[PDB]
Amino acid sequence: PVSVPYASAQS
Amino acid sequence: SCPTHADSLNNLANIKREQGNIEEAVRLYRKALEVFPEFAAAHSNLASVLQQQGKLQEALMHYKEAIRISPTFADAYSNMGNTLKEMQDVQGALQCYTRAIQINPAFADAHSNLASIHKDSGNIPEAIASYRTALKLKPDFPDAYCNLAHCLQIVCDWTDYDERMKKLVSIVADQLEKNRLPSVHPHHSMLYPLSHGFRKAIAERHGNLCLDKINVLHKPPYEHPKDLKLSDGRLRVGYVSSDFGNHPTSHLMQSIPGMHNPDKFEVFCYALSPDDGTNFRVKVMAEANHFIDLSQIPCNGKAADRIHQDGIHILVNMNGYTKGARNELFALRPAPIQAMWLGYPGTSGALFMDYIITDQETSPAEVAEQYSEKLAYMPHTFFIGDHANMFPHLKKKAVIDFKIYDNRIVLNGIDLKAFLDSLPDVKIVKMLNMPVIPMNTIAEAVIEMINRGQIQITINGFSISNGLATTQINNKAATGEEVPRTIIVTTRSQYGLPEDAIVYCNFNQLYKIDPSTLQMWANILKRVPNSVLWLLRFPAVGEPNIQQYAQNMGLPQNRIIFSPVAPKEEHVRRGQLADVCLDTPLCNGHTTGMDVLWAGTPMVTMPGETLASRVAASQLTCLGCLELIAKNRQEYEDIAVKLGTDLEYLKKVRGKVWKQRISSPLFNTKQYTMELERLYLQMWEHYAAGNKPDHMIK
Ligand SMILES: CC(=O)N[C@@H]1[C@@H](O)[C@H](O)[C@@H](CO)S[C@@H]1OP(=O)(O)OP(=O)(O)OC[C@H]1O[C@@H](n2ccc(=O)[nH]c2=O)[C@H](O)[C@@H]1O
CATH class of the missing domain: 3.40.50.2000 (Glycogen Phosphorylase B;)
Structure with a gap:
């Protein structure tokens, strides 16, 4: 659990 | 009022689109609809260029029209979905896709478009299901093949890995050559075995996606400043990020805007995203000379003006092709110098981006042909971290000896030292140097806390905290927004690691x-x-x-x-x-x-x-x-x-x-900033001299 912010594509 | 007339006009417009000339296509489509308003296919076709041009508002109205006329037009539902998606209305777009599949069970794009929503919600097993279905129905479908490939990548499904890779390259090769936008997303391109020219070429194309979205504003080039007179000898740097909040980008550079030299630089921060509430956002707002919330200004035209208004010499793009980015801003060219920095690990492939900020280890000159921008080198690494400021409790540690290992049971805390001083029998290993607590009642108390899985205990008055429960003891310290005000125990047994x-x-x-x-x-x-x-x-x-x-x-x-x-x-x-x-x-x-x-x-x-x-x-x-x-x-x-x-x-x-x-420059944000300042001024001098950007490799 706990999710954390990460980088990702522009979709 | 003639269908045939209109019909021919449509045929013409589709031609004009093929020859890439968008301007004209729209004009014809609009005339086709003037002649015959009840024209479904015209409505559908005019919609998708309006969509391309980023005029969604309107493109939607036309898709809605198309459907009303042809209720079986499955292709229009699917696209309307894409539009609604791009309008942050996921709910309604989801409805379109499902509605389309229900009407034409065999229509493959719907199945893919649906998968793509699932992908963005981070439910992957479902996204994959739906991609597999889409590909079954239409075994030649790049977009679906590529997106799938990426999911399989994320779950580490490596079935037919080598054939899958070759196949990707294969598809991209075709699409680059057929002048069609490539299914691989530039951010993912680094994961596959493509050529560097291929990678640059992909980036390049997404570069052109913004270019069209702004052409339709019809804006005159901006007059850039040529000296520092209006800004009182200060160079005006503008950071533009969608991640001034709780987000890695902030975790890295939150200190930097604070650390600029006010004599020589004036710092502008442009948030692309609304205030999330966290201390990261707060610090940046508190410490930048000016903080501008561009999420209040959705229009890229007015936003760019607002930048040019502020008189920015160097505009820094921290997003590249990542979530929440708005490169249309950069494409409008409001500052004379525009540099890529930190946020995106790759070339922009775009004309409107002047420099990429890096170093010799990361981008050695041999491989300058990978990037479309000129290289600007930092003297050590272009990377940086706030860790020193964000996590000062990790500067020093102390260990328990439970039988001399440095990583079996650890203790950190701002007040660790005073607590060790309360203790009778501490031993002092040299390296600074590492305090070691011997296996006494104290040590036993601590370890039993860990074992029973208790939140915290108290020893000689100091709070000792289970380093698995920090979000309970102090939410803010667990996220990195506050510095922990207790001592925290961390051990291998907590994570089921073998002690030896x-x-x-x-x-x-x-x-x-x-x-x-x-x-x-x-x-x-x-x-x-x-x-x-x-x-x-x-x-x-x-x-x-x-x-x-x-x-x-x-x-x-x-x-x-x-x-x-x-x-x-x-x-x-x-x-x-x-x-x-x-x-x-x-x-x-x-x-x-x-x-x-x-x-x-x-x-x-x-x-x-x-x-x-x-x-x-x-x-x-x-x-x-x-x-x-x-x-x-x-x-x-x-x-x-x-x-x-x-x-x-x-x-x-x-x-x-x-x-x-500690002693190297790596985690040194002050020194880092000053170098970044050097590199800025170098860029400026050179442009003020009358020169187009060239490599700053020193
Ligand atoms: C390949 C790639 O996209 N690179 C990007 C860089 O080019 C950008 O410069 C960096 C942002 O600008 S982010 C990115 O760098 P990466 O290292 O890939 O980070 P990523 O996007 O996976 O998230 C890891 C986060 O999870 C946190 N994290 C991780 C595990 C955990 O248990 N808890 C946790 O908080 C970590 O502390 C991080 O906060």
Whole structure:
């Protein structure tokens, strides 16, 4: 659990 | 009022579109509809260029019209979905897609479009299902094939890996050549075995997506300033990021706007995203000379004006092709100099981007042909971390001896020293140096807390905190927004690590691993009998797959240990338990690199060609540990194994990292900033001289 912010594509 | 007339006009417009001339296509479509308003296909076609032009508002109205006329037009539902998606209305777009599939069970784009929503909600097994269905129906579908490929990548499904890769390249080759926008997303391009020209070419195309979205504003070029007179001798730098909030980008550079020299520079921050409420956002707003919320200004025209209004000399793009980006801003060219920085690990491939900020280790001059921008070198590494400010409680540590290991039971805290002073029998190992508590009632109390899984205890009045419960004791300290006000215990037993093992960790998202990368580790683990590999459930669906491939390479289950994802502070801190970090060479640990180094944990890397596969090396160089940098698979394995067997050598290196992280420039934001300032002024002089940008490689 706990999710954390990460980088990702522009979709 | 003639259908035939209109029909011909449509035929003409479709022609004009093919010859890439968008301007004209629209004009014709609009006349076709003037002649015959009840024209379904005209409405549909005019919609999708309006969509391309970013005029969604309107493009939607026309799609709605198309449907009303032809209720079986499955193709229009699907597109209207895409539009509604792009309008942040996921709900209604989802409705379109399903509605389309219901009407035409066999229509393949709907099935893909649906999968794509699932992908963005991060439910992957469902996204995959729907992509597989789409491809079954239409076995030649790039967009679906590529997107699938990426999901399989994220879950570490490596079935037919080599054929899948070749196939990708294959598709991209075709699409680049047929002048069609490539299915691979530039941010993912670094994961596949494409050429560097190919990667640049992809980026290049997404570069042109913004270009069309702004052409339709019909804006005159901007008059840029030519000297510093209006800004009183100050160079006006503008940072533009959608991640001034709780987000890695902030975790790295939140200190920097604060650290600029006010005499020579005036700092403008342009948030692309609304205030999330966190301390990161607050600090940046508190410390930048000016903070402008551009999320209040959705129109790219008025936004760009607002930048040019402010008189920015250097505009810094921190997003590149990542979530929440708005490069239309950059395409409008409001500042004379526009540089890529930190946020995106790759070339923009775009004309409107002047410089990429990097260094010689990450982007050596041989490979300048990979980028479309001119290189601007920082003197050490272009990377940087706030860790020093964000996590000062990790500067020093203390250990319990429970039978001298530095990573079995650890204690950190701002007030650690005063607590050790309360204690009767502490022993002081030299390296700074490392305090060791002996196995007494005290030590036993602490360990029993850990064992019973209790939140916290009190010893001589100091609070001792279970380092698994921090979000309960203090939410803000667990996220990295506050500095912890207690002492925190961290131990191997908390994560089910074997007390007497060699722990190789890698804390990255699992998409960074490929079958090669795993093979190497498999080898290493075989040659080092007391070892375990420590990974993250990131995502959890990923775990069984690795376990699978690990088992086929001949590893018992108990050889690889998975831990769940943790909040930033716990995540960083438990890096101290590990012995060596083993870095993914397909795509390096970036923020993670900094994180594991801060814990004093040496990291083995094998630098490749792509920027992103080189960052870790670049960090280690700056730190001063070249013996951790491998020239090939072979050497990689050996460096690891040497560390894992030669406990004397291990201790030597670990101590080096520990010391170096302070004394080297790596975690030094003040020094970093000043260099960034140098590089800024270099760029400026050169442009003020009358020159177009060239390499600043010094
Ligand atoms: C390949 C790639 O996209 N690289 C990007 C860089 O080029 C950008 O410069 C960096 C942002 O600008 S982010 C990015 O760098 P990466 O290292 O890939 O980080 P990523 O996007 O996987 O998220 C890891 C986060 O999870 C946190 N994290 C991780 C595990 C955990 O248990 N808890 C936790 O808080 C970590 O502390 C991090 O906060």
